[PDB]
Amino acid sequence: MERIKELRDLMSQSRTREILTKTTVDHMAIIKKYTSGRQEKNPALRMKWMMAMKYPITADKRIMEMIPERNEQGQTLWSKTNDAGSDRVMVSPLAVTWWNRNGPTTSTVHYPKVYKTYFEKVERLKHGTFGPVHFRNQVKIRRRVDINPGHADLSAKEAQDVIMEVVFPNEVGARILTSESQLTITKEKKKELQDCKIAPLMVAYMLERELVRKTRFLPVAGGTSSVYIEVLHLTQGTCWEQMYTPGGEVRNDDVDQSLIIAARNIVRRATVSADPLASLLEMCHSTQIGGVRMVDILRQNPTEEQAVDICKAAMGLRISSSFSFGGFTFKRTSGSSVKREEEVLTGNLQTLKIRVHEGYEEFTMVGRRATAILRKATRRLIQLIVSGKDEQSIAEAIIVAMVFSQEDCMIKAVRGDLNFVNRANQRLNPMHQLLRHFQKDAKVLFQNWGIEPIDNVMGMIGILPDMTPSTEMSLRGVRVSKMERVVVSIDRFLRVRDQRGNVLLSPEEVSETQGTEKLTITYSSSMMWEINGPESVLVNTYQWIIRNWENVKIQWSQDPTMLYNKMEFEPFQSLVPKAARGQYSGFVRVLFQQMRDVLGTFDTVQIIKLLPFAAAPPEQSRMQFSSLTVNVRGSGMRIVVRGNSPVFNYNKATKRLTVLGKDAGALMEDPDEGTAGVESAVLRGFLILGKENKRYGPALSINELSNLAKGEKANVLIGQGDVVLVMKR
Amino acid sequence: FEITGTMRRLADQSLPPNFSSLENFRAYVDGFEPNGCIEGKLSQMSKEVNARIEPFLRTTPRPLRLPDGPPCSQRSKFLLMDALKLSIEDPSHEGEGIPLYDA
Amino acid sequence: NMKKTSQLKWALGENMAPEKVDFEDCKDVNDLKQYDSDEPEPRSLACWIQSEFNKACELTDSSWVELDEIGEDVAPIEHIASMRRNYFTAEVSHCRATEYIMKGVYINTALLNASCAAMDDFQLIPMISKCRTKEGRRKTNLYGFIIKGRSHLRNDTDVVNFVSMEFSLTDPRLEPHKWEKYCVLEIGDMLLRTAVGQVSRPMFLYVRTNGTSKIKMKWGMEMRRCLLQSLQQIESMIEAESSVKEKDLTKEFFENKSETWPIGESPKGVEEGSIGKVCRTLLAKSVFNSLYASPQLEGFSAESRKLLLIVQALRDNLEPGTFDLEGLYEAIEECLINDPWVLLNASWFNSFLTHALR
Amino acid sequence: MDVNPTLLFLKVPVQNAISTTFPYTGDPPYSHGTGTGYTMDTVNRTHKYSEKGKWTTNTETGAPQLNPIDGPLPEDNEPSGYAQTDCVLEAMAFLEESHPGIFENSCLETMEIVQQTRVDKLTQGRQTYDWTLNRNQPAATALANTIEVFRSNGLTANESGRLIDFLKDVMDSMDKEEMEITTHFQIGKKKQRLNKRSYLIRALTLNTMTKDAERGKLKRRAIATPGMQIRGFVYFVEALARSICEKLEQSGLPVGGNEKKAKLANVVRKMMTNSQDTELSFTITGDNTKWNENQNPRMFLAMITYITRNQPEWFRNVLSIAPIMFSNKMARLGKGYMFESKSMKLRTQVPAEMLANIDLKYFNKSTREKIEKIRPLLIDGTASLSPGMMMGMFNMLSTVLGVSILNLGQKKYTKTTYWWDGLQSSDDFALIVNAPNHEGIQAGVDRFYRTCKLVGINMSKKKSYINRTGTFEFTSFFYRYGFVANFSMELPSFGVSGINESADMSVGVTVIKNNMINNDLGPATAQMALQLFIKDYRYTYRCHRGDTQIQTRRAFELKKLWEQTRSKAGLLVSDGGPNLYNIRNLHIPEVCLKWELMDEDYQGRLCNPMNPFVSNAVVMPSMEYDAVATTHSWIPKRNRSILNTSQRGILEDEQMYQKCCNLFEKFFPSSSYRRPVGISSMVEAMVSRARIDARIDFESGRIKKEEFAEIMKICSTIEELRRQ
RNA sequence: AUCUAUAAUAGUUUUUC
RNA sequence: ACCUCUGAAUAAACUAUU
RNA sequence: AGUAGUAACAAGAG
Ligand SMILES: *O[C@H]1[C@@H](O)[C@H](n2cnc3c(N)ncnc32)O[C@@H]1COP(=O)(O)OP(=O)(O)OP(=O)(O)OC[C@H]1O[C@@H](n2c[n+](C)c3c(=O)[nH]c(N)nc32)[C@H](O)[C@@H]1O
Ligand SMILES: [Mg+2]
């Protein structure tokens, strides 16, 4: 009634009637932003200039009745001058600080409810626990982290639609909530906010603070969850780490993810030790995940993962030999596999490397709405027997099975602009990208998969590409049907065998992906970086060599065997490719032996660079190496044997060794350093004498030096665009 | 969304020199296939259009040439190394008392 | 408010702006022409700016900044930060550059507040600073007086004229070229004591007409960021060493004074100073960047950064190569015109080239 | 001992002390007078770079237009705009061949964007050159004036609310024989009726001015403000260029911050890994000389034509309009000049529109030469500028062109032992060259330089250098085996931002936290920064501690509030309370940080929704950096300079606009939360909503039949008033 | 595992003779 | 002359916050 | 005069 009377009043005036008639709803936004021009260019200067004025602050005209014109000292609090383009009056800051001491008082009891997020921050800081401060060689990595967690199974647009449904039911337009998560959250918030006495706009902003996810790229070390990101300034520094645990309640999915990350790191590190089982146990007892001991989490966490199950089995716990893939819990009833990287060409003409599992295997798929039995061979689906609930559940199960099968048809079914790198050029998991692509639109995948006639066995139905229950022909190898932890023993080499004696898990089955933890992973031992990421592992390994250079040098001179067997090099050896560990070790050991027998050719930097590669059991081959590869976030990063490298660059001007762009420390020149330009640790069986010498014909390559014999000097294009004279001993 | 009238006339004058209508240029671009154009233009271009790299050795750089003229003069808003202060023992914090009284 | 006398009307540029007329009514005037838009007159580098910078880097006997309070320390990292901040504050509060910071902040704040409050008045503004002596007693200092002209400032570059009367003991006749803008009086005989006897020296008043704008006054009021600029770099160096040493080195740097950095030059050669010396030097450099801000400084910094990067690449054995190095030199030297600070920076760059390539 | 700060680099690498080379504590340089000299210099230089091109006279505007496309191949290393169209088309073709489907998918996304974008997208921005007033206006104000003029001239296709319909209206306006406008003077309204050529000159005109507060530049430079007619087309072209750039690994746009640094580092490391160990690698820290004064709108039209092959005609037309309008663009000369008579002691403003036929005796030598060079180009008070992209426009399309030139450096294209790749962001670039020896490196650099010359890109020799790969500079980011921190760049952000007390406190603490996270701001320096910010905040807002005797106008009120308070820690710093911030709680709003320390009555007064300083409820007015609104979230006064002009009716008009908008919000509660959409008028929408709501309330029994009948009667009265 | 909400404000980056 | 008014908003991308 | 620097301010408008 008041609204319609005010509208009738505005329609009676000539100008307001013109505005109301000639302005459409679309142009209402334009006229709402319409202004004469707020000449604001330097707000800091403008504020400093205005705070010297008598009345720099505007206020509503009610202040002339709510606040007196003058205070006790007679100072004026407001003036009758109106602000430009409005009926607001000009007031002094004295008016605001007078209100804060003499104004009417209301009940501020609903403020903690309306601003629950900020008071939640206050509570998390209040009940948080601070640990010691450790000064370390920090290696921060720019990654996408969430600063506002929002709701788990929601996006920004879905959260906005849910908010509109909850707060403005009659303004939702054509949107209908389809996701079951949206319906559940909508019902929950409608019941919780029933008979609420807050303004609807304020309620909408509360729900935005509560439900809308926000992620950003930040240079982050430690946990990437919101509770750790909000205190990232406090907990992480350039040279220090502050141990801290937020005081609130920790989400369990973050615990699961961090446990998976820690277990994978621990298992991969333990695989290279002499006794993997003891190393795994002592690492699991020394690991904390968000202020909680890892062993307790393992005892009370039902997470289906290979490394987590290996960690459980090492401690006598019962495991479920299962894993997750695309929202389903797989379990290998029978079969075996060996991973193998195979490059494939996508349907949209993209080249990528996919970890292909060889061998024949059988699986069972379990999901919240569907169940299936899967048999497969190398990149070939033998059969799939789905027994889902509705059409969409069976469709999702079929899509997941097709992606899992790694069928070349599935690869060639890719269309559109499907990206396999991050927006920051970070490599993504190809299988996850294929899943997300085919879960948006799978018509082309089903079309190109094929068809196959069914023989009507047991009455199991067929399925057509458009999701219909045919009885004559079905998708190739797909059939439709209708609707436990075990005690294990773990070997010395982390081989998990069932009570009967069959192998269930192995270290080779552990994923090679190097992820990051949602909750900060604290490791307490001599090497706090022993289960850290590859960048931290490399930097800290070379810094450990630098700091201990005196006794390491003495041991290298006297007893190299014990030096190569230091436990500190094992995290490094977990980065060297498994097939090349022995070759690199043997090559580097031969280089070191030649370096010892040729006095004066003592290059400190060469020894420091090549030492971590000698920690593996040596395999003797005649292959020459110009560079050694190290896996860093999936890409083999080479360390060039001669000269600097992206991983390892030594600066002679500063005497400062920089690894992956992180300072590792300054070396000190040895008296036995060779100030003569003679190198003996570059070629396996050839000693560098000097620069180019045209007397010995044209320059050749390192990979063609076998034909040379004893004393045959030659010129080799070893290194980055350099030719030097080498001789054979 | 059709380009007609004044917009068409402007479009007919927004082309390379050897095209008279936007339709002709569109037809040329639609049928365009790369046929050694860049290589031929590079061969035609004279060898004087190059980016020669001159090494920057330790003996390469020269000192900067400072201008010649009368010596520079002080321009700061207050004295820096020549300022004299008349001081009083006033147990008051920064900006408390009346500036004129303190002066 | 000072009386609008003839001497103040002249000194503050009263009625010096020409009458604003229409081009119709003055197009036939013989000498009517475009504003003088010539380049600045070149000036050569004099030795006094190096002495000014040397004096701005020194340690004073008084504490010049009284930093406010923060919350109580709870985290251990907060206690470590408080210890390091104690070292930083001990180094930075007793530096002449901090006195310049406080003096400039006070002067610019007073000028801007008077400019907004009294558009059409000549205000007398004393130059006041507060300090704590070595024995902790508060002390109020008077440097001189400032008279503000009219301040009907429309643009951010509009100039307000002021007259600066400042006490000094420096004889203007020893370096006359430095004081070309000043009229120096002799207003008294101050009694100083060197070791045991009272020495009588003349007390001079350096009077000049000067001007500033709203943007300059704002950036003078915000002069306390020089502390941040110096201290962030100092702490970056400290933490860079701590990262490879795996322990805090703040106390080792500030007390043991084992690690030194080349910070100056003597007739013997390059001289290296402690972490506190480097902190004071960087603070003085930032303060002088604030006091002598000019387009010449901006151009020189931006253009000489490239040459610094090229020299660094040469020192890293990265085989640097240029294409039009003479063009780069011309671009750098285009900015060296008449600003003493920029000319001193150019001399420093020449010294750096001499030392960095031998 | 003479103190030499520069000698610090003898031990500290330059990248690790790069903050010392940014003197960002003093005031930046400003421009004092006119920008006409710089604009004329830019026009003359742009035409000089293309002087060997073909001259034509535009049949629609009469402006002389210079066409450098397919001009003679250069014989020297001077800058030139003689881009070859076939070379640009071949670069586009090879870019499409190396990334199959990039243009098709980008066109699909851009078609969706074009079909869905609303007209109020044009209001996003500060200023738009209003052709109805021949000066800059706020973007919303310029759009409103343009829409009103179009409606008065029977151009009402924009009433759909879509941006493409507004562009159709612009195109239709181009064909009107006469466009009518309305002018104010000393305050009456006068109708002015432009002719076809005059309106066409106004619509193709970009305003010009000087750039104030620019760091690192000795001399000032000109900048441009696009008009209302071209903004939508530029938005659509930039949307297409953005779609293309998102799919390119070498692109430096549109990624910024830590994401940009991570992408650049990953791309550089991928290039290093792909490089063979037995070959040299060099990186070029490269700039381009006068990129925007040498690139031609005709080449952008060619690029858009190649990109939109096999697309619907309407999409190609709507994308092509922007380069076409940009190749016929005119430039406003600016304010003009001021003339000073020393003898008669007078000064006067000379408008830029008189420079066509003004006597040249007044001007000095350089300005006279500028005017003599530019007079043939002057038409209708503007300068004909056919070549060049004016200022800060089509940056991502420039990035696309640069990335295509970089992409030309694969071994499949070089067909030799050298190859190149690198990074591209608008005009700035970094180039990595690999070759078996130094001769190959030189050959690859030469080939890159000559190819850029072919496509009209001139590599600044005096601002570029080359060294072994591992250190470079790109878009002011300094890479030394990884991007280093640069604190001096963010140093001006510290301080009182000038919104209000609450917002400024939040900004200060958030800036300290962000610089701790990103720019390696140490904890001790963070505490000192907090102290300095608190000091500046207290001085700026006259809110020193209650227990001090700082004599300000606000000090008595703060003393009174301090005396009556029981728990002093609960008072905000704006109210004279103490500073409770430290490193651990930088992320917490002040009102929430000390909420439980406040007195009940003080807290009730501070957070009182019935207070006049901010427009069970809570305080609400656009609450940037203000989590909880208090009485300290006030709004300062607006500038009152408009009251002395003839545009002072805009104040009354915007007051009535705000009144109508608030009345509308009384009918559609979600309008403020989410922008409403609709072709119906405001009164019609409100009446329909009132009728449906009254019917529903009657049906559910919330109101009785008498009130329903009263609402229906008032609605009928409003409908009757609507027609008359 | 993925991950450019929308909008507003401020800040930052983006030079011929 | 009194009187009266007024102290001055480029583009794009990004970042931060709401 | 001074600020300042390629053009301005040294009050403007009514
Ligand atoms: O966030 C990561 C991880 O922590 C999270 N995750 C893992 N497990 C869980 C559980 N149990 N609950 C909640 N979240 C979980 O998912 C993310 C995994 O990321 P990433 O490590 O990059 O992927 P991963 O390396 O695990 O590979 P993925 O594609 O997800 O496959 C998982 C699992 O499936 C095995 N597998 C695939 N194929 C095609 C196989 C096959 O043909 N034969 C056999 N025997 N195994 C196959 C993968 O090798 C992994 O073992
Ligand atoms: Mg560059």
TrEMBL record, chain A:
Domain Influenza RNA polymerase PB2 CAP binding positions: 320-522
Gene: PB2
Keywords: Cap snatching, Eukaryotic host gene expression shutoff by virus, Eukaryotic host transcription shutoff by virus, Host gene expression shutoff by virus, Host nucleus, Host-virus interaction, Inhibition of host RNA polymerase II by virus, mRNA capping, mRNA processing, Viral transcription, Virion
First-listed, main subcellular location of the protein, grouped into a coarse class: host cell
Highest rank taxon of the organism: Viruses
Cell compartments where the protein resides: Host mitochondrion; Virion; Host nucleus
Species this protein is from: Influenza A virus (A/Zhejiang/DTID-ZJU01/2013(H7N9))
Every Influenza RNA polymerase PB2 C-terminal domain range: 675-729
Domain Influenza RNA polymerase PB2 sixth: 523-672
Descriptive protein name: Polymerase basic protein 2
UniProtKB/TrEMBL annotation, chain C:
One cellular component term from this protein's GO annotations in UniProt: host cell cytoplasm
Post-translational modification comment from the UniProt entry: Phosphorylated on serines and threonines by host kinases, including human casein kinase II.
Enzyme superclass (EC): hydrolase
Keywords, in A-Z order: Cap snatching, Endonuclease, Eukaryotic host gene expression shutoff by virus, Eukaryotic host transcription shutoff by virus, Host cytoplasm, Host gene expression shutoff by virus, Host nucleus, Host-virus interaction, Hydrolase, Inhibition of host RNA polymerase II by virus, Manganese, Metal-binding, Nuclease, Phosphoprotein
Primary location: host cell
MF terms in GO: endonuclease activity; hydrolase activity; metal ion binding; RNA binding
Note on how the cofactor is bound: Binds 2 manganese ions per subunit.
UniProt-listed GO biological process terms: cap snatching; DNA-templated transcription; symbiont-mediated suppression of host gene expression; symbiont-mediated suppression of host mRNA transcription via inhibition of RNA polymerase II activity; viral RNA genome replication; viral translational frameshifting
Subcellular location: Host cytoplasm; Host nucleus
Recorded superkingdom: Viruses
E.C. code: 3.1.-.-
Cofactor: Mn(2+)
Subunit (UniProt): Influenza RNA polymerase is composed of three subunits: PB1, PB2 and PA. Interacts (via C-terminus) with PB1 (via N-terminus).
Free-text function comment from the UniProt entry: Plays an essential role in viral RNA transcription and replication by forming the heterotrimeric polymerase complex together with PB1 and PB2 subunits. The complex transcribes viral mRNAs by using a unique mechanism called cap-snatching. It consists in the hijacking and cleavage of host capped pre-mRNAs. These short capped RNAs are then used as primers for viral mRNAs. The PB2 subunit is responsible for the binding of the 5' cap of cellular pre-mRNAs which are subsequently cleaved after 10-13 nucleotides by the PA subunit that carries the endonuclease activity.
Similarity section: Belongs to the influenza viruses PA family.
Protein name, per record: Polymerase acidic protein
Residues of the full protein shown: 359 to 716 of 716
UniProtKB/TrEMBL annotation, chain D:
Keywords tagged on the record: Eukaryotic host gene expression shutoff by virus, Eukaryotic host transcription shutoff by virus, Host cytoplasm, Host gene expression shutoff by virus, Host nucleus, Host-virus interaction, Inhibition of host RNA polymerase II by virus, Metal-binding, Nucleotide-binding, Nucleotidyltransferase, Phosphoprotein, RNA-directed RNA polymerase, Transferase, Viral RNA replication, Viral transcription
Residue spans of biased composition, Polar residues class: 55-64
Organism: Influenza A virus
UniProt lineage: Viruses, Riboviria, Orthornavirae, Negarnaviricota, Polyploviricotina
Keyword set includes Phosphoprotein: yes
Pfam families associated with the record: Flu_PB1
Function: RNA-dependent RNA polymerase which is responsible for replication and transcription of virus RNA segments. The transcription of viral mRNAs occurs by a unique mechanism called cap-snatching. 5' methylated caps of cellular mRNAs are cleaved after 10-13 nucleotides by PA. In turn, these short capped RNAs are used as primers by PB1 for transcription of viral mRNAs. During virus replication, PB1 initiates RNA synthesis and copy vRNA into complementary RNA (cRNA) which in turn serves as a template for the production of more vRNAs. RNA-dependent RNA polymerase which is responsible for replication and transcription of virus RNA segments. The transcription of viral mRNAs occurs by a unique mechanism called cap-snatching. 5' methylated caps of cellular mRNAs are cleaved after 10-13 nucleotides by PA. In turn, these short capped RNAs are used as primers by PB1 for transcription of viral mRNAs. During virus replication, PB1 initiates RNA synthesis and copies vRNA into complementary RNA (cRNA) which in turn serves as a template for the production of more vRNAs.
Chain ranges for the short sequence motif Nuclear localization signal as given in the UniProt record: 187-198
Binding sites annotated in the UniProt record for Mg(2+) 1: G286, D287, D428, E473
Residues that hold Mg(2+) 2 according to the record: D287, N288, D427
GO terms for cellular component: host cell cytoplasm; host cell nucleus
Root EC class: transferase
Chief place where the protein resides: host cell
